[PDB]
Structures are given as C-alpha cells and as structure tokens.
Amino acid sequence: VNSFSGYLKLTDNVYIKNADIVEEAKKVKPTVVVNAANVYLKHGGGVAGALNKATNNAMQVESDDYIATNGPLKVGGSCVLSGHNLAKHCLHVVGPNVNKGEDIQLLKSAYENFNQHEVLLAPLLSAGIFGADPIHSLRVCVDTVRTNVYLAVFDKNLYDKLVSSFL
C-alpha cells in the first residue's frame, strides 16, 4: 500500500492520472520522482523547468556540480540526485529528443532506468518539448517498466486520449 491517490490502473504495474507531476510530488513526497532531463541537466522548461522551479533552483545548483564532476549523461541514461523538497530522490532520465535527430529506439533504454527503483512517480518521456508522440511513449513504458510506475499526465485532452485509446 502506498499514498498515491486517484490513479487509474492500466496494468499490473502501471498507473496513470491527469496531474501535474510537480503537484503530485509536493503532495505525495514519493521516494523517487523522475525528471525528464536533457544530457546537460539544464532544467529550463517542461517537467524539468517546473520541478527545478519548485526546488527554488536547488535542483539546478546540484545538477551543475554533478555535470562539472561527471560530464553529460548519455541519451537513454540517468542519474540519481536529491529530490529536494519534492521527493527523497530524483531520477533524472534522458529520453531521445527527436527534434535533435535522436533515435526513438533510445526511448526503451530510457525507460529501462525505471526498473532500478521499486516505485516511481514519473512523466511520459520524450513527449512534449522532446517531440515524440505520447501515445507511443506510454506503450514503451508499459512494455519496458516492470516496477510500479505512477504516471502523471499534464494535459487533460492527452490523458483522456491515452486512456480512451489504451489497449
């Protein structure tokens, strides 16, 4: 039993809700929140910009130190950093940016990072400002993640559509 509330159950291990991941994190304070990061951990917009803003820029300060030490992530890769005031941890995951010409096959690799954590609050990866189709992203998530994932979908029309169109 966990403290996620009001989620629609999609599969054995995948749950979904029309919600802002930032608001879900502030209320639930989960163990792991997933950030839809880029390779530079430059949290400028979308999920990352909103999460970072909610941490009063502490996420960005921590991230800049991480990059200065370790260099950029790989597309499809991840790192675990603090969750600040939003969660115990933040799993920064880089999905492919198809506007950058990045291989959409890397979306499966990105979701594989979720399997290292028993329970996660997450957004759909590679969609939105990253350019990919959120319908496809949900399919890859369901077919890749085996741990318990609670997906927060920001846009109602999209949520209603992913649910109505989910097989």
Ligand SMILES: OC[C@@H]1CC2(CC2)CN1c1ncnc2[nH]ccc12
């Ligand atoms: O797939 C992630 C969705 C799509 C978006 C890039 C346009 C933003 N996005 C979010 N998904 C869930 N919670 C959120 N809070 C702020 C943004 C956001």
